[PDB]
Structure formats: structure tokens, C-alpha cells
Design an enzyme around this catalytic site. Structure first.
Site, PDB file in Angstrom:
ATOM      1  N   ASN A 194       0.853  -1.179   0.000  1.00  0.00           N
ATOM      2  CA  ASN A 194       0.000   0.000   0.000  1.00  0.00           C
ATOM      3  C   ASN A 194       0.892   1.233   0.000  1.00  0.00           C
ATOM      4  O   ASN A 194       1.474   1.589   1.028  1.00  0.00           O
ATOM      5  CB  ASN A 194      -0.906  -0.031   1.225  1.00  0.00           C
TER       6      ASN A 194
ATOM      7  N   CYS B 199      -5.736   3.027  -4.768  1.00  0.00           N
ATOM      8  CA  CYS B 199      -7.075   2.461  -4.895  1.00  0.00           C
ATOM      9  C   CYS B 199      -7.048   1.098  -5.570  1.00  0.00           C
ATOM     10  O   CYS B 199      -6.416   0.151  -5.088  1.00  0.00           O
ATOM     11  CB  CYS B 199      -7.985   3.405  -5.686  1.00  0.00           C
TER      12      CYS B 199
END
Lengths: 13, 333
Positions: free
Chosen positions: B9, B14
Site C-alpha cells: 500500500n 485504490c
């Protein structure tokens, strides 16, 4: 799409 | 481990991590990406090189892969960039770059032969003798959800005949305004099918989620939606990827469910966490922290082995291997 909720109207066009 | 490594991440990417794994296990696409002529490209601005780097890291690294260079590569760096755009747009940005890179090569046209299909859009007048047939190409299909309970009904709505009555009468030109019918029917279906599930609507001022139940089968027959079916190659498809979003009030978390070998052995790719999961958890449990399934990937049964070819470490050219290891040397110092 698909990132909701949002106030962008470029999603799905 | 699990044989599959994750993506870290790293910012508001997204759906980007979910899409990257989906393309990574499009094994035939992956081998084409490895063999692209990207020698002598600028690392800071090359999307084909960035996609090669992330695929290589996803194939060899035992620690989760970073995507910072790739995010810089296609320049989605504004605060709202990933939430304003679509999964389709990001896939178009990447796939167009790779396909454009493959022009003039031995592997040219891999993207069109995997994802593009033929479609006809028609407008037929009822009282006057005029019809307009035009051919379209598509790389993805946006499916209606509200009021449709499963993919079968969703596709029926896509091929449903639209009516052009008064106040919408078709401009038939020489024949004047006419009360025609407008529709679209499928000519051909690609080996890899990208289906986007349009579960949203826009009252208030926002696009909200349609959390309604929607069923998608593990095996999707689509012969009846073809204008003329082909024996010895039915439009039979096998579910490959299920891209999911999780839905508290603002929130938003993008994970992808995959059976990379098409064998029904499913895994959940939650960024850096890749874990085994039940087929019930991947298919039935995503029908609809409200979790919603928004994108599906199907692979044609006749093309399943070729699309999911085995990919070995030698499939990657040695000069590609040399440049990436050199970059990792520079970072380690």
C-alpha cells in the site's frame, strides 16, 4: 468507478 | 509463503493493486510484456518499463512489491486522481502503452487478441426501409445492475431493443424523422473478458453505491448473446478475477479474488497479504463495511490453457533482467 460515495460525474463515461 | 507475492500500500492507488495482479495473472499478457523492446527507455517516464519492473518483482521477490515508479510513470499524482478515474481508464492507460510499445515487434497485437471483441450497433426504422449498421470494438463491458439479479439478466438488458419514439425519433436524413429501434448485439467475445458492474446511481449531490445482490456464475455461457454462435468454440467462460471494494460510509478498500491457474483454487490478494480462501468466499460471498463486487474477469474455456501459459524465469530476456537488478543495486546503496 468504483470509488463511492463521491460527487465526481466523470465516473462511467 | 503461497507462491504469490503482494503489492504494498503506497499512496492512494485504490484499485491499482487489484488491477495489477489481474493483469499479472493474465499470463499470456505477462510474457508479452517481458519480451517488449524496452531497452534504452527512460526509467522516470516509461510505462512499459514500469509494468515490466512490477511484473518481475511480482514473479521473483519474496517481499511485497512497490509501485511508486509506476504511479509516477503515468502521472496520476493529483489528490483526487485515482478516485475521479475508473478502473477501465487505468487499464486503458496501461494496456494502450504496452500495445503501443509492442508495435513493430514479434509479439505485436497481443492486447487486441486477448481483450478486444467485435460488436455491431444498429438502428432500424420500422415504417421506412432504412437501417444503419456500424461496427464497434470494445475492450470492456459496462453492465447494468439495478433491477438485474444476475449476469444473464444483465446481458439480456444490454442486448435489449431500445425504442426511438416521438421526441426521440431517429434522424433518418433522406427519410426524415422516423420511429426506429436501436440496439446492439455481440459479434465476437474476447479470450479475456473484462466486465465492470455498474452498481451506482445519481437528489443529494453524490454518486452512491447500489449494494443490491448480484449473482455471477463460475462458468458463464454467452453463446445465446452472439449473433451467430460457432460450434467447436462455444462462448463458454470461466471466472478468473473478482475485484471487490469494501463499503463503510467513506472508507474504501480494494482487494481482488483470483484463481491464477483457473483451477478453482482461489486466493485473496489484500495488498501485501496474499492468502488462501474458499470458493464460496470468492464467488457467493461477493453477491452483495458493505462489501461490493464491481469488476469481473472471465477467460474463454477454449483459450484457458493458452491465456494461462506457464511462465518460467527464462521467459524474461537477460538484458531486461540485467537492467532491473542494476536498479535494485542502486537503491540498496
Amino acid at each position: 468507478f468504483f470509488n463511492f460515495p463521491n460527487x465526481y460525474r466523470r465516473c462511467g463515461k | 509463503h503461497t507462491g504469490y507475492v503482494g503489492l504494498k500500500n503506497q499512496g492512494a492507488t485504490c484499485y491499482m493493486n487489484s488491477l495489477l495482479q489481474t493483469l499479472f495473472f493474465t499470463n499470456q499478457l505477462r510474457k508479452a510484456v517481458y519480451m517488449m523492446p524496452t531497452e534504452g527507455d527512460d526509467s522516470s517516464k516509461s510505462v512499459p518499463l514500469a509494468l515490466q519492473r512490477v511484473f518481475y518483482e511480482l514473479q521473483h521477490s519474496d517481499k511485497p512489491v512497490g509501485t511508486k515508479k509506476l504511479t509516477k510513470s503515468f502521472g496520476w499524482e493529483t489528490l483526487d486522481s485515482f478516485m475521479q478515474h475508473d478502473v477501465q481508464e487505468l487499464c486503458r492507460v496501461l494496456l494502450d502503452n504496452v500495445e503501443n510499445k509492442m508495435k513493430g515487434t514479434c509479439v505485436e497485437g497481443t492486447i487486441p487478441k486477448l481483450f478486444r471483441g467485435k460488436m455491431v450497433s444498429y438502428i432500424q426504422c420500422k415504417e421506412v426501409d432504412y437501417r444503419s449498421d456500424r461496427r464497434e470494438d470494445y475492450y470492456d463491458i459496462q453492465l447494468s445492475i439495478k433491477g438485474k439479479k444476475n449476469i444473464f439478466e444483465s446481458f439480456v438488458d444490454y442486448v435489449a431493443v431500445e425504442q426511438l419514439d416521438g421526441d426521440n425519433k431517429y434522424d433518418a436524413g433522406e427519410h426524415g424523422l422516423q420511429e426506429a429501434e436501436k440496439g446492439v448485439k455481440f459479434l465476437t467475445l474476447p479470450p479475456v473478458l473484462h466486465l465492470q458492474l455498474m452498481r451506482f446511481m445519481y437528489q443529494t449531490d453524490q454518486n452512491i453505491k447500489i449494494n443490491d445482490r448480484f449473482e455471477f456464475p463460475e462458468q458463464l455461457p454467452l453463446d445465446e448473446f452472439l449473433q451467430k454462435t460457432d460450434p467447436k468454440d462455444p462462448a463458454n467462460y470461466i471466472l478468473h478475477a473478482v475485484l471487490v471494494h469494501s463499503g463503510d460510509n467513506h472508507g474504501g478498500h480494494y482487494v481482488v479474488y483470483l484463481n491464477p491457474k483457473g483451477d478453482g483454487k482461489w486466493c485473496k490478494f489484500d495488498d501485501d497479504v496474499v492468502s488462501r480462501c474458499t470458493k464460496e468466499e470468492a464467488i457467493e460471498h461477493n453477491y452483495g463495511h458493505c462489501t461490493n463486487a464491481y469488476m469481473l474477469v472471465y477467460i474463454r474455456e477454449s483459450k484457458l490453457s493458452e491465456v494461462l501459459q506457464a511462465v518460467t524465469d527464462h521467459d524474461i530476456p537477460q538484458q531486461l533482467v540485467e537492467r532491473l537488478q542494476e536498479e535494485k543495486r542502486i537503491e540498496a546503496q
